[PDB]
Amino acid sequence: XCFXKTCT
Numbered sequence: 001x002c003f004x005k006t007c008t
């Protein structure tokens with residue numbers, strides 16, 4: 001999904 005200030 002997403003993490004911190006990035007999403008994948």
Ligand SMILES: O=C([O-])C(=O)[O-]
Nearest residue numbers: 001002003006007008
């Ligand atoms: O958890 C995740 O998928 C990431 O940090 O990209």
